[PDB]
């Protein structure tokens, strides 16, 4: 929102740089759904999508691969978008946010992917720009969670065709929050798996996975709290761009965020306890070794010196040829060992 | 009026007057030589390396009109960065850092700058500095510093200082990477010491860079008539550079604080292994030596008569018992 583009060291002035590490593909897809007819337009050129600024019907423009900085700059210039908005679009490492401008609304959100067999939680930034009667959308890799809205527009289901671009923005944000819900479900599955594995098989890999889950939950916290704040600000006042008839719907989304926030600390609490549990559990394993070792001492270490007490090379030893002295002393020794084993069975060791 | 710093080894005074036509400079301990340049219409850069001598600082203050409080602050090396403004002069304190690759610590120096009329006065503490780029730019006419007034000189000094911060950040990144491979592949206790030292260094960097960001932001937004309206965008550039530095320090602290966790939690399962080896060796040999003592008991009344070869039978019994202990283990695979 500042009047000046923020400088960087080592770059020529007024340079826009992509920050993320995704450069595989690029795509543009335009959906101009009217009250009666809709259009789908997939392309790689950027001069074809630009004229769609002034379409009367609501329009949804989606650009994948913001690694192509020139396309982002061109689309920003053609739509009267601030250079700092472009810098925010191309800066991946920032938390979700919302900024209200006179001509458009700018939103930065995160969508997550979670992979089994590789416990890595990956965040992909999407930028939404509500401008007049159009919705620009900037992803950075192929694939999203907005397919349900696509089928809703394609097959006339729901209310979306009846309404303007504000309802489209609401639909996109609600889809993103539902993706958050399914992410939480996946993390619940993995945390149950981890809890069982830690409680019954403590090794090094379990601790590595537990700390990985800890960092993943921390990142979810850091991305979900600003999401709650921006949904609040979206539904609170928003005079200019969003009609009142829409702000109840945004209300629901806000509620969802609160739930998600609560859940994460539930999860957080569990994993924040899990580490401690692991320590106890691993100590338990060592205890068992203790038990065994203790036993192999108690019935074997003392016997030795009695097996040495009257097993000396001592000239003054009376019981040298006693009547069955060896059998009776060995029987006494075996009795002592048996009764001490029973005594340790009393402690159940 | 006492020098808080503990460094008094070397003292020098170095001055350069410069202009569009030609420049002059000198390196002498004379303190009177700096006085006439107060009246020079040209911009001049006057530096007093040694601030341990209070008399020269007092004389410079009384000649240039520095208020006693900030003059006393100049000697106070233990001061957070700040700014102060006057009707004729402005006063800014910054810090310069020296970091060594081999010795994992950093040293801090308080550098005072005073801007008044056409003269910029620097108060360092010791020889060795990071103003060589701007100094060479003035000497060799490279850049546009000579054309501009005395304020661009202050801008260039702050620019050189932030560039030194950037090279320090490069070194810290280097060491953090090396430490990452180290902790991933060679975890031990001196690694813990090194990580803790690095964390303290980054904490110091953060707590010094944030006041410096405030210094630059105040110097930009306040923009008194002394600081002029022509150096303002350049000060905005320096402010953005400070933003970069702060974000980099923050993420470095995140990484280094995250390094130590898995190693620290990895304890108490090596004790499991030493117990495993201890118990496997004990439960094999100690009962065996007990058996040896029993059948070697010197009682004088035993079946010492061989009958079948007895010594081979006893050795075979020992071997069989050892084998049965080996078999009994790793059935639950705990070892």
């Amino acid at each position, epitope marked *: 929102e500042e009047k000046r583009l923020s400088a*960087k*060291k*080592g*770059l*020529p*002035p*007024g*340079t*826009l*740089v*992509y*920050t*993320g*590490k995704y*450069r*595989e593909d690029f795509e543009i897809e335009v959906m101009n759904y009217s009250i009666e007819e809709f259009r789908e337009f997939k392309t790689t050129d950027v001069e074809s999508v630009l004229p769609f600024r002034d379409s009367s019907t609501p329009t949804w423009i989606n650009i994948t691969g913001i690694h192509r*900085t*020139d396309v982002v*700059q061109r689309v920003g210039e053609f739509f009267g978008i601030h250079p700092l908005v472009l810098e925010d679009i191309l800066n*991946v*490492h920032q938390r979700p946010k919302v900024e209200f401008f006179e001509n458009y609304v700018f939103i930065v959100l995160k969508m997550f992917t979670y992979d089994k067999n590789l416990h890595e939680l990956e965040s992909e930034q999407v930028s939404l720009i509500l401008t007049k009667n159009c919705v620009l959308m900037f992803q950075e890799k192929i694939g999203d969670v907005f397919d349900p809205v696509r089928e809703r527009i394609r097959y006339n289901r729901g209310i979306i065709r009846k309404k303007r671009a504000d309802y489209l923005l609401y639909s996109l944000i609600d889809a993103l929050v539902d993706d958050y819900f399914v992410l939480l479900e996946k993390i619940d599955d993995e945390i149950d798996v981890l809890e069982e594995e830690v409680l019954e098989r403590p090794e090094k890999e379990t601790v590595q996975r537990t700390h990985q889950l800890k960092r993943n939950l921390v990142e979810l916290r850091k991305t979900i709290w600003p999401l709650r704040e921006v949904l609040s600000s979206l539904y609170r006042d928003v005079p200019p761009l969003i009609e009142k008839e829409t702000v109840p719907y945004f209300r629901d989304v806000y509620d969802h965020t609160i739930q998600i926030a609560d859940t994460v600390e539930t999860f957080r609490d569990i994993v924040s306890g899990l580490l401690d549990v692991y320590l106890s559990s691993v100590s338990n394993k060592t205890n068992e070794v203790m038990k065994v070792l203790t036993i192999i001492a108690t019935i074997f270490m003392p016997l030795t010196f009695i097996a040495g007490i009257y097993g000396m090379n001592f000239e003054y030893m009376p019981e040298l040829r006693w009547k069955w002295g060896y059998p009776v002393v060995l029987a006494v020794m075996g009795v002592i060992a048996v009764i001490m084993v029973v005594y340790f069975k009393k402690k159940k060791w | 009026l006492v020098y808080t710093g503990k460094y008094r080894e070397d003292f020098e005074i170095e001055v350069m007057n410069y202009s569009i036509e030609e420049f002059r400079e000198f390196k002498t301990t004379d303190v009177e030589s700096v006085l006439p340049f107060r009246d020079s219409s040209t911009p001049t850069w006057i530096n007093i390396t040694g601030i341990h001598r209070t008399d020269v600082v007092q004389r410079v203050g009384e000649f240039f009109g520095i208020h006693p409080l900030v003059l006393e602050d100049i000697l106070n090396v233990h001061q957070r960065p700040k700014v102060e403004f006057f009707e004729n002069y402005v006063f800014i304190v910054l810090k310069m850092f020296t970091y060594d690759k081999n010795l994992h610590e950093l040293e801090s120096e308080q550098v005072s700058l005073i801007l008044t009329k056409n003269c910029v006065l620097m108060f360092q503490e010791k020889i060795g500095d990071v103003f060589d780029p701007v100094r060479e730019r003035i000497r060799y006419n490279r850049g546009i510093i000579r054309k501009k007034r005395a304020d661009y000189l202050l801008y260039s000094l702050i620019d050189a200082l932030v560039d030194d911060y*950037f090279v320090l*950040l*490069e*070194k810290i*990144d*280097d*060491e953090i*990477d*090396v430490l990452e*491979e180290e902790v991933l592949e060679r975890p031990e206790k001196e690694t813990v010491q090194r990580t803790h030292q690095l964390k303290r260094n980054l904490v110091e960097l953060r707590k010094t860079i944030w006041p410096l960001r405030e210094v630059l932001s105040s110097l930009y937004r306040d923009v008194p008539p002394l600081i002029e309206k022509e150096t303002v965008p350049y000060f905005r550039d320096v402010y953005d550079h400070t933003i*970069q*530095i702060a*974000d*980099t320090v923050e*993420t*470095f602290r995140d990484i280094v604080s995250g390094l130590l966790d898995v190693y620290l939690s990895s304890v108490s399962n090596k004790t499991n292994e030493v117990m495993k080896v201890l118990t496997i060796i004990a439960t094999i040999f100690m009962p065996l030596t007990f058996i040896a003592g029993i059948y070697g008991m010197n009682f004088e009344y035993m079946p010492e008569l061989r009958w079948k070869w007895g010594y081979p039978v006893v050795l075979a019994v020992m071997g069989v018992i050892a084998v049965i202990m080996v078999v009994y283990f790793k059935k639950k695979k705990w070892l």
Partner: antibody
Amino acid sequence: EVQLVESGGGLVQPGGSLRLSCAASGFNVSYYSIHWVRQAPGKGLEWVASISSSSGSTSYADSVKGRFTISADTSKNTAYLQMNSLRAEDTAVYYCARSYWYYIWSYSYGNAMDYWGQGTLVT
Amino acid sequence: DIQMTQSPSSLSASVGDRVTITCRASQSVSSAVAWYQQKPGKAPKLLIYSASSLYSGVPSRFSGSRSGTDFTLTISSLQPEDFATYYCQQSSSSLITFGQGTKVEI
């Protein structure tokens, strides 16, 4: 879709001046950086110059400092490298390369010469 | 000015064996180093950027690594077309600088 073609080199007596033109197709010079690189045949690559037409900031190698002059005609969408007082070692192939910056940390930025031209001999 | 040293000067090997090339700098550069191929009579082609990141369309057999100021390029599974001349760059400073050049032969 992106192509770079170079023209204006191949032969000139030592001590002269000659300008190499870099024409870019399916690509806009406004939003990217253009690098001139040198390679003597049978030897290694040597960076020469870099121009960012968006601002006009100009970077030169340590070998040809001040000797050369690089510019970019945004309207014509070309990059010009004018070499002056050609020396004995300057006989080499000159390559034109596209540049894009990436992100490592908030303080360090680096660019990669992903696209290259054909490269033209100069003697 | 900053200079980069790329070693070994040459490396002769068959196919199917890991090929490692190392590359260092006079003063440490963070990660702004890139690895390029060069065929005889062909312009260089980017392989690795940011010292560890594969390009688009480059085959995964190539892989970059960093250890402080020591960068490496490795070819775990060589293919018959891999034999070429390999180069570093430095992008940390505004003054780009290459390596000497390492040629892989049979």
